[PDB]
Design a protein around this ligand. Structure first.
Ligand SMILES: *[C@@H]1O[C@H](CO)[C@@H](O[C@@H]2O[C@H](CO)[C@@H](O)[C@H](O)[C@H]2NC(C)=O)[C@H](O)[C@H]1NC(C)=O
Ligand SMILES: *[C@@H]1O[C@H](CO)[C@@H](O[C@@H]2O[C@H](CO)[C@@H](O)[C@H](O)[C@H]2NC(C)=O)[C@H](O)[C@H]1NC(C)=O
Ligand SMILES: *[C@@H]1O[C@H](CO)[C@@H](O[C@@H]2O[C@H](CO)[C@@H](O)[C@H](O)[C@H]2NC(C)=O)[C@H](O)[C@H]1NC(C)=O
Ligand code: NAG
Ligand code: NAG
Ligand code: NAG
Ligand code: NAG
Ligand code: NAG
Ligand code: NAG
Lengths: 323, 172, 323, 172, 323, 172
């Protein structure tokens, strides 16, 4: 028996498993898990910028100024918007919001508004502007959406109601208006005096008219009547014109888009915590260098890529073979 | 394994070789011990590193789900959106899971090849100056001291230098 | 010459071909075809549950109760719906069906209805309810959609027509109504007496109004007039309210969704046969354990996955090499 | 083939070997006959079985077409729907057809490797007790009876046992 | 030392690089670039058929017959349509075009029209048809869309306006009509005499009505009023019926689809050059046998397949190894 | 390389071999020179040609972008369309770029295999009539003229013909 040299390979105490094509459950000396599976369970600031927490409010409740949503009358720049699945505080006076989903979609590219008083209430000198509803009651008294004006009869008169705003703000401006559809003729006459009325909205590109609809409907929040809201994004230097012989719910404000960018609405029942993140999901925040994650498909920020997988492990070392 | 070395003609791995993936165990008068092959371990390391960057970088522009909402009169559009986002999710899941299975197969075979290639390199250098035992070991027909072992390991074994001595020992 | 041992491999009489990357048309000892290419040419029950065969009827003809569709007045639970490309029996009185495709989409998750008499005809004591049309003639006489009520003048009077239904059925309920748009004023006066009429529908979420349209139109089935139908899915415990001074086509019934599940409408001219299946296509039924098929992309049930391929064969054995 | 055995140095397959994919034909004084190698055939069988389950299971969440309808005022949406469903159909067709081409290539090479590995296993055990003829056959330098053949086939050939007898025959 | 035979492999002076999985930047003896990266920078005929170059006109300006678009009054068959991002000449009398995008989509399968005089102007014997606008001025005088007829009062009368056309042309026919929404009542009375008017359009399948809307709007091209245009594709042997007590903008023409096929609208500021191609992009024409290209995703004709890649090179030869 | 021949035991390529991918350099009394192996070069050529048609033909039904427009009230639908077309674009980009990386890896290894297979073919034919030098060269133990070299190159080397002459030279 003489001197020897032997060729061989590394083995260790590793129990790391990988799958291959020909064989599953293979032990290897070294392996790299490329799937992030954990999150912090918290809603966080995204790059130091807090989300807008709607609380019990809907997007509509916020923008109309539902009195239950007063904390949201002036809000700072946000990184994302948190909304509940079924917020309680939306249209307190019942009705509908035309193209509501399209409005929500617009919000995913908007990070801040400046609310601008475009049609001061005091300027409606020929109409009453104090009208509210027990549906929007505040401290046991009739009130109304903060951003809106309910024009009604004054001195048993409702003359043609005309208002105009030129968007000189420097940015596109979200404006909302509504039409009141009463329950009955007594409601029509006592509020507006006129019968067979209309609401007319016109810009350079929009031409929209409504005739109000008097009909018996099931009471929602105590009201058989309905308010149908619409919106537009008024271009810079374009003018919006309102015109009505009755039933107009006028905006007092416009929301100038003051900041643009990648954003979004996250559906969650949770609340903002004092934590910071670069990637947020509805289940919690992710902090990883890994390329993939399986936490939730709907994420905001600088995120890994989402896959359905339970496991993604790359072999780096060799087959780990018993001594 | 495809190349027949790992869990093959070289039956087991070495717990005692701690500083690399492939290497040597020598045995002579001066003693014995394990040593990693530096060149082949580094080349395997560079390849594997490149593979793990390449797999990662190919899924940098994966499909991302955007949260949209739809009214009760937009069920076909909602379903279309759902089918589309779920459709891409399944495509990328499949892509990620298959790339990994395929690249894992190749990685294990790559290591197997590297061991086999290292064995053949040493074999093709020693020639008939050694006995091939069949277990990954070579038995010398001449005395091979520590400096002789290191010439084998760093690829500068001098066959003509030992030819005549080996020839005599192998014959008698 | 001494004793010998030889290493070798299997060969057989196999003519199985596979393709690879480097070479096409390779003979192998064993192979596994993974593509199902055959079907039985029949429309079948799906897990023992027969489809709903519309025959010459459309979805609209069925739900309105086109008199040519009377076999469909009460139908049992179905696994899928068979409809012809161009069914003859739809709107016998001509017109349109608002959001018709959305209605058809709803049906792909519905497996059974219970038809409920929500607004009994006998309760319209102030209006005539017997009115029909030669467009919907039965046995040479004017008739009408079975599920609908044509309200007309009574005693040269058409008082305000009001009907209301609270969905206490326990499930969401499909309800359909219509508005008659006459050809001329003589038609308007003789049917409804009133001029400048409206139809109003209201739930907690829907507020829909139509004013009828008198216009000369090309005759369809002998009629210049048109009936425009709409629908809603009334929520449990929600109330629907109808209100009209004329031109209302009222439902007598509602379709309570009594069974939900994965279903669909299959476009076919064929007829149901006494056969059973787990996977149905418009060309016929599939019975296979194979993972893929190329029969038709539109399938219902527990199906293989569809691909466009003409062939998918996996090599399992080795290259089959001549002796 | 990548490994050079099938349709390679082993020129043809054996119709007479019926009970496995790879194996032996022996020839000695007692007679001759084919026998499958049980271990290598079963290992190949397990791998291939796993491959055919793995390919099948990766396309379990493939895209499925849902039948929707669209009005004459919804042509862009109809086209979008059509493009989407056709888009996924082409993705999965490509996926299924490519996976099969690639895995067929690998399967054929896997078998080739298994034959080569079996040849090398036998070779590395017999050493210079045999002549390597170059056609997949080994010619013994010593008489190898039926029980000797079975030690070769089940991997327990005793080289030291035959060393001296072979050595003498090979020399004279 | 004896005679020798050596096994070896090809090397050349190639500097071709490829990437692999284990290693990037690999020199190989031979390589095949499969990505086309170049184009001619020109807009060209596609198979000898020139595109329709709209110039400063929009699709709407063309089909309505905006007088600035007169070169387009009769156009030959096209291979694609070139339109500018923001064409100057569209609706010269301001307003809107219902389902405009759907109309543009229809055009991507249309390669030629025959313009047919379906409602000759001379046949409106009870109305004035000469009316135009300074918004569509020609040579300093009021004019109007060439394909349209502005019906106005005659002898201080506007009797019911009725026109009808049976599509006997042999193909589907595009027809456009409009409704005038005036700025004020003085405009309503002086043009149409009647107040509380309507426009009614009916085919076998379409039933569309508009009541005009008098409202103060910002002046566009000098006009507070608006014209709202709609369109339909009238089926062979179907009849279209128009009916109005005022405010109708009637078509004089219909556009019979005379040629169908794969086409499209290309957004470009460029102009057609005397060049021929089989594949056109907005950046220029492609002439290649290569399977992939990275020029632009939006192409027309027999094109390579588009990818985002900067490079796609297949190794064909072996690793190029220094002597 | 996976098979250890190219940039492996055969250290470098031959600039002087111009008419094929793989082949021979011979050296004898009559002289020296390079010659391509015709059979192995053509077989590699057929495979590679098939591969480049196969990769091309699998992306013939790739997704194609259709130009659609959307109004300012159709932003969700526009975004859906954009996501869908961009989604497929990224799928096909990934597909094209990965297929190429993977097939490039295999192509280079295929060539490596072909060289190794050619070396082994020649080796398994010459047997102990030659010395294996370890650099891709064989040194003859008998005089091998030009016609002898061509029998090696076209695969009809006559081992029994030279057995006895080689045996004597190798021994003394
Ligand atoms: C609304 O306000 C603007 C800004 O004062 C008016 O004046 C011009 O509008 C253009 C529109 O593109 C702006 O770019 C300029 O700032 C203004 N030009 C000048 C010379 O002052 C605009 O006319 C107003 N609209 C109406 C209907 O009065
Ligand atoms: C319609 O019918 C329901 C059931 O009788 C009415 O009564 C309640 O409605 C709620 C709605 O969520 C149901 O959950 C309950 O079953 C009912 N509660 C009680 C205490 O009886 C409902 O009010 C009716 N609607 C109208 C407008 O009368
Ligand atoms: C419109 O014109 C057609 C063609 O002249 C009219 O006549 C028939 O219409 C059918 C419709 O499918 C055509 O196929 C035939 O060419 C015509 N048949 C006969 C026997 O002449 C059609 O009736 C006209 N429409 C109206 C309302 O008058
Ligand atoms: C994998 O193999 C291990 C042993 O290596 C065994 O104990 C275990 O059952 C397997 N694990 C799983 C989760 O399949
Ligand atoms: C290789 O190893 C020997 C023995 O230790 C050493 O002396 C020599 O410097 C090394 N040579 C090379 C080329 O690395
Ligand atoms: C495939 O090869 C067979 C012989 O193996 C030949 O007869 C036939 O033409 C080929 N088949 C096809 C369909 O290409
Ligand atoms: C191998 O084969 C021999 C010869 O037939 C038999 O006697 C022995 O039991 C076998 N040994 C093993 C380890 O399987
Ligand atoms: C690739 O390698 C070459 C030498 O082969 C080197 O000069 C160059 O930097 C590399 N090229 C790129 C673009 O990475
Ligand atoms: C092979 O080469 C020899 C030597 O030149 C030649 O004579 C013979 O014809 C060839 N034989 C075959 C089988 O190709």
């Amino acid at each position: 028996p003489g001197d020897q040299i032997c060729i061989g390979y590394h083995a260790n105490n590793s129990t790391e498993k990988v799958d291959t094509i020909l064989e599953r459950n293979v032990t290897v000396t070294h392996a790299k898990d490329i799937l992030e599976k954990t999150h912090n369970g918290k809603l966080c600031k995204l790059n130091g910028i807090p989300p807008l927490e709607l609380g019990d409010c809907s997007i509509a409740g916020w923008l109309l100024g539902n009195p239950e949503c007063d904390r949201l009358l002036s809000v700072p720049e946000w990184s994302y918007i948190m909304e509940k699945e079924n917020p309680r505080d939306g249209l307190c006076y019942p009705g509908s919001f035309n193209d509501y989903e399209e409005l929500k979609h617009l919000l995913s590219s908007v990070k801040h508004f400046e609310k601008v008083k475009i049609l001061p209430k005091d300027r409606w000198t020929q109409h009453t502007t104090t009208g509210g509803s027990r549906a929007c009651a505040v401290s046991g008294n009739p009130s109304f959406f903060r951003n809106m004006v309910w024009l009604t009869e004054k001195g048993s008169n409702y003359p043609v109601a005309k208002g105009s705003y030129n968007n000189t703000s420097g940015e596109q401006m979200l404006i909302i208006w509504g039409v009141h559809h009463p329950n009955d003729e007594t409601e029509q006459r006592t509020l507006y005096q006129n019968v067979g009325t209309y609401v007319s909205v016109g810009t350079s590109t929009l031409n929209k008219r409504s005739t109000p609809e008097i009909a018996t409907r099931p009471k929602v929040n105590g009201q058989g009547g309905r308010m149908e809201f619409s919106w537009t994004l008024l271009d810079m230097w374009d003018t919006i014109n309102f015109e009505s012989t009755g039933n107009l719910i006028a905006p007092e404000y416009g929301f100038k888009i003051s900041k643009r960018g990648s954003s979004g609405i996250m559906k969650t029942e949770g609340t903002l915590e004092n934590c910071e993140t670069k990637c947020q999901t509805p289940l919690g925040a992710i902090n990883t260098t890994l390329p993939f994650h399986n936490v939730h498909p709907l994420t905001i920020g600088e995120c890994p890529k989402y896959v359905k997988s339970e496991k993604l492990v790359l072999a780096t070392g060799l087959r780990n073979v018993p001594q | 394994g495809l190349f027949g070395a790992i869990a093959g003609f070289i039956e087991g791995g070495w717990q005692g070789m701690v500083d690399g993936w492939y290497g040597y165990h020598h045995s002579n008068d001066q003693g014995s011990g394990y040593a990693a092959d530096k060149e082949s371990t580094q080349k395997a390391f560079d390849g594997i590193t490149n593979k793990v960057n390449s797999v990662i970088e190919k899924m940098n522009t994966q499909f991302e789900a955007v949260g949209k909402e739809f009214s009760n009169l937009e069920r076909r559009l909602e379903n279309l959106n759902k089918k589309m986002e779920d459709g891409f999710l399944d495509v990328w899941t499949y892509n990620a899971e298959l790339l990994v299975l395929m690249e894992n197969e190749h990685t294990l075979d790559f290591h197997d090849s590297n061991v086999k290639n290292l064995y053949d390199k040493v074999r093709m250098q020693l020639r008939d100056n050694v006995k091939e035992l069949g277990n990954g070991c070579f038995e010398f027909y001449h005395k091979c001291d520590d400096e002789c072992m290191n010439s084998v390991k760093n690829g500068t074994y001098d066959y003509p230098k030992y030819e005549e001595e080996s020839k005599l020992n192998r014959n008698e």
